[PDB]
């Protein structure tokens, strides 16, 4: 029932500030002229981009590649992930290494203090699926939840 | 017997009148906006409720071969009433 949100408080045109100070409506060629001109001024490491939310991996690379030619690599995201050791490295630290289908092929789980029920509710169904049909026992840490 | 915009144009059954900043109103220039004043939502509340006997009945639209396929209703709600999606009639149980 989110599609209703896709037609409610949604952006349409390239807006930009007013000499007064507020926002108005312009064209793409009216706006991007204001941007690349500013991009050519501040470069190197006074520059950064925050992805997050609901984004491609097509724009991310181009957006990366764009700030890749301005010597600026401070590409960040909303929610943290640790980096003190092998953070982005070694693709077993930010994945479901376990096949989500393999959740059936498991007798034990340790849930750390998050809610499958509310974060990815449908990782919780394969739990409850494998809670009923095949035996399974779970143990949770922090935040007692229903 | 309709309600009207501050720009002065006629509203439909639905709130449909164009904003002020709209080039669409051109088509009404030297013409006029066709509209039906007979809002069903106004006519239908101007219809008395048929307070029948037994809790379940059939309804029709004035002629069994002539409208409103024979749907039924459970009139257990003494709080509200029961409607038929074809018509806009309403009913009670009398008890």
């Amino acid at each position: 029932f989110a599609y209703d949100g896709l037609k409610r408080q949604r952006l349409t045109e390239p807006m930009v500030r007013n000499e007064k100070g507020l926002l108005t409506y312009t064209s793409w060629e009216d706006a991007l002229s204001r941007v690349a001109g500013m991009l050519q001024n501040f470069e190197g490491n006074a520059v950064a981009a925050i992805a997050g939310g609901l984004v491609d991996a097509e724009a991310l690379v181009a957006l990366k590649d764009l700030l890749n030619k301005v010597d600026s690599d401070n590409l960040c995201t909303e929610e943290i992930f640790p980096t003190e050791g092998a953070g982005t490295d070694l693709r077993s630290n930010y994945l479901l290494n376990t096949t989500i289908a393999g959740v059936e092929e498991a007798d034990v789980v340790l849930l750390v203090g998050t809610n499958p029920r509310f974060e990815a509710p449908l990782f919780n169904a394969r739990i409850r699926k494998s809670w009923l049909h095949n035996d399974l026992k779970v143990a949770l840490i922090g935040s007692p939840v229903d | 017997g309709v309600q009207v915009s501050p720009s002065g144009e006629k509203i439909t059954h639905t709130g449909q009148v164009y904003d002020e900043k709209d080039y669409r109103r051109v088509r009404f220039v030297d013409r006029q906006k066709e509209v039906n004043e007979n809002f069903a939502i106004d006519l239908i509340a101007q219809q008395p409720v048929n307070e029948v006997e037994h809790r379940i009945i059939a309804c029709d639209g004035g002629g069994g071969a002539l409208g409103h396929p024979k749907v039924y209703i459970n009139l257990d709600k003494e709080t509200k009433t029961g409607t038929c999606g074809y018509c806009g009639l309403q009913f009670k149980q009398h008890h």
Binding site: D65, N68, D71, D73, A86, T88, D89, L90, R91 | -
Partner: protein, 83 residues
Amino acid sequence: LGLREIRVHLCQRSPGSQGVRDFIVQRYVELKKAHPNLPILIRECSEVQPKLWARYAFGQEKTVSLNNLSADEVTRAMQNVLS
């Protein structure tokens, strides 16, 4: 000027990608300990070329094919890039 990246393309199980798998268990931690804030990254497809990209400051990159290269030479192949 500077390199500011290393990345690693390999295949999980194949003769061609061999040696990279040897390279990781044998040296990876120490380089990441020598190069802590250096943004490395390592990925393992199925039937890809065992390749190795590495950026520079102006998004400039190079490639070094390492098809059927053993661990000792891959390391020199990595340090010639960290030369």
